[PDB]
Structures are given as structure tokens and as C-alpha cells.
């Protein structure tokens, strides 16, 4: 039960982004998934895991707004929320960020197909990489070109893992790269794993 | 001015939310200047140790009262209450709305009924902020008559619809009848407030 300013801000932000207030919503992903996203960013911040937050696959922007908000709550000035998608138009998503006072230089957009946008994206490192989308191709493109920038201790979150195509992209990528970090359930559809450094 | 602490962010968001700036239904339509003024008044009372509860008379869907409870919550104030007085936009609806923000609790109390009936007996002993919304001479005078005397020195009286002649007249008559000359301060085109000396 929230009591600090921070907790109250973040609790309200979850309620807001998911339109719990006015039963349109900026994300439909639900509390468990928003909570997980919070846990992952907070753990990265807390354990000093370096890097930005990258979200691929975007509805109206609620989960990314929430991520910028978390960083704002802890007054983090040196990390960026990358928002990657085809484009639910880009203008709409910017407007939405703007509505929460969270459209600023620490939010950057990557319009285009992921095979095009990912190899060159100016981020050097990621602390959290979150994929939303049930397509094998999108999932594999993001893994192939962005996961290698995910810091040890960082999180990879797969929103639509229960969908076989998505799952398969995830297993194939992991098996190809020898990755056996524990897959942890978030809810009926999503999972994540925390990246371990290579052995020594 | 530009929020950065947890408290400022919470309150800023709560203003944006209660006014439905996010998704433009809204819980209050009174606007930022007026929400800001309400915040300044509650914060000043808290900071300057002005004792008492917050009383709001005249209620739409409850946004301004929600905001007030939120302000007290942000500074973890456990010893003051937000009184929500109105006819009844039904009482159930307003409660549900408080509830949506996680702010429906024992520090929010409701006073359904006409102000001539509800005010004389309302269990609050003192007020730090008294806010009137409504353009009726009668409602305005009823609240001033039976509640203003419980407003602590240093407390604030806010008049949402002061530009409306009927409201203005109730306010000037009440002040002249009681010798009150505390400066009337403009909030925007329609509302004003004064701080009790
Ligand atoms: Cl899209
Ligand atoms: Cl009403
Ligand atoms: Mg999904
Ligand atoms: Mg009014």
C-alpha cells in the first residue's frame, strides 16, 4: 500500500496509463505486467545495471510512458526510454507522453520495421528490453540485433510468450546462443529472464 | 513549477487526472489555475500549522475533493479530514470516484443535504480551508453563516463563482455584516479567495 510520494506517483501512473480511473486506455497489458515492468526497472536501477530501456511493439504508449515515469520518479537523468514500432500513429503516442508531462529528451522514438531500425539505434546498452508482439519475425529481429546490447543483470521481457510463434522465436534464439537463464512467469501470457554474464 | 520530487509528481499527475487532461467525463472541470490555488491553500495551511479540516461545499463528480484528499495523503497527514458537502453526481458515484484513486477512507466524510440543514451540526470543530463552489446567493450565504466562523485564523476561504453577481453579493454582504476586510485575491476570471486574519 503506497505512502511515499514516489509510491503514490507510480501507483497513480499505473492506474492512469491503464485507464482504471475512467471506466481508450494507453495500454491494456494489466497490473501484473505493469508491476513486472516496474520491478525490472527498479531492480536495474537498484543493482546499478547500466543501460537504457527499450520497448519494441507499441499500442498507444502506456507501458513506455510508465517506464519514463519510473525513471522520473527516481530522478534518473542519464537513461533513455526508446520506443520502437512501425506505426497508434507516432504523433498520437507523443501527444500521449505529453499529456503526462513526460515527453522530453529522455524519450526517443524509432519508427520503422525492426530489421531496419535495430542495428543502428544509438543506444550502447540496455538495462531492460521489453518485446510486445506475437510474431516470430519481430521477436527474432529484436533479439538478434538488440539483445546483445543488454547488460548482464538486465531483463528481457516477452509479453506474448504464450503464443507459439513467439515462444519458438524465443527458444530458438536462446538455444542458438547457449542461453539458459531462468524463464520466469509473469502471468498467463508473458515471461521474462534476467541475463547472466558469461562464466569464469 | 516543474515537478521533480515524488510528492510534486504525484500531485501534478493527480491534477492532470482529476481534470481528465490525460484522456481528452472529468471529475472536476474547474481548471489548473483553480486546482493550483487549492493546492497552494492546503499547503500553506499545513506548512504554517493552521489547524483544521478541509471543507468543500458544492460538488460535481468530486475531483476537487479528491485532489484535496490527495494533497493530505502526499504529505502523509493523518489528523485532518476532507468534508464533502452537497445535495446530491450521486453520492455513490462520488465515493466510487474517490475509490478509483485509492483515496476513499476514514479521512473523507460526506455531508448529504441542503447546507442550512447539514452545516450547523457538522462534527468539525475547525477548518483550515473552506472552499465554496456554486453561484447561488443562498448556498453561499448559508455556508458562510454556519461554517466560516469555524475557519481558523490563517485559514483560506475560496469562492469559486465570485464573478457571478449573486455569489458576489452574498460574499460582500456577509463580510460587511461581520466587519471582514481581509484582502480578496483574484485566482482567475471567476474565482477568488481570502486568508483569514
Ligand atoms: Cl503500432
Ligand atoms: Cl451536485
Ligand atoms: Mg501483447
Ligand atoms: Mg464553480
From Swiss-Prot, chain B:
O-methyltransferase that catalyzes the conversion of mycinamicin III to mycinamicin IV in the biosynthesis of mycinamicin, a 16-membered macrolide antibiotic. Pathway: Antibiotic biosynthesis; mycinamicin biosynthesis. Keywords: Antibiotic biosynthesis, Magnesium, Metal-binding, Methyltransferase, S-adenosyl-L-methionine, Transferase. Its EC number is 2.1.1.237. The gene is mycF. The lineage of its organism: Bacteria, Bacillati, Actinomycetota, Actinomycetes, Micromonosporales. It comes from Micromonospora griseorubida. Disruption phenotype: No production of mycinamicin II and accumulation of mycinamicin III. Its cofactor is Mg(2+). Disulfide bonds: none annotated. It catalyses: mycinamicin III + S-adenosyl-L-methionine = mycinamicin IV + S-adenosyl-L-homocysteine + H(+). S-adenosyl-L-methionine binds at residues 28-29, 56-60, 86-88, 115, 133-134. It comes from the Bacteria. GO terms for molecular function: magnesium ion binding; O-methyltransferase activity; small molecule binding. This is Mycinamicin III 3''-O-methyltransferase. It holds the Pfam family TylF.
Amino acid at each position: 500500500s503506497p505512502s511515499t510520494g514516489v509510491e503514490l506517483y507510480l501507483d497513480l501512473l499505473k492506474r492512469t496509463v491503464s485507464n482504471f480511473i475512467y471506466q481508450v486506455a494507453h495500454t491494456m497489458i494489466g497490473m501484473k505486467r505493469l508491476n513486472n515492468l516496474q520491478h525490472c526497472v527498479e531492480s536495474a536501477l537498484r543493482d546499478g545495471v547500466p543501460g537504457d530501456v527499450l520497448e519494441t511493439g507499441v499500442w498507444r504508449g502506456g507501458a513506455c510512458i510508465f517506464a519514463r515515469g519510473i525513471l522520473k520518479a527516481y530522478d534518473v537523468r542519464d537513461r533513455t526510454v526508446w520506443v520502437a514500432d512501425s506505426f497508434t500513429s507516432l504523433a498520437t503516442v507523443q501527444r500521449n507522453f505529453s499529456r503526462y508531462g513526460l515527453l522530453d529528451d529522455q524519450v526517443r522514438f524509432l519508427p520503422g520495421w525492426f530489421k531496419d531500425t535495430m542495428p543502428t539505434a544509438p543506444f550502447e546498452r540496455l538495462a531492460v528490453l521489453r518485446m510486445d508482439g506475437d510474431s516470430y519475425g519481430a521477436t527474432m529481429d529484436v533479439l538478434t540485433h538488440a539483445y546483445p546490447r543488454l547488460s548482464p543483470g538486465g531483463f528481457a521481457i516477452i509479453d506474448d510468450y504464450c503464443i507459439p510463434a513467439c515462444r519458438e522465436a524465443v527458444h530458438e534464439y536462446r538455444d542458438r546462443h547457449g542461453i539458459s537463464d531462468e524463464i520466469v512467469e509473469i502471468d498467463r501470457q508473458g515471461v521474462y529472464w534476467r541475463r547472466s554474464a558469461c562464466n569464469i
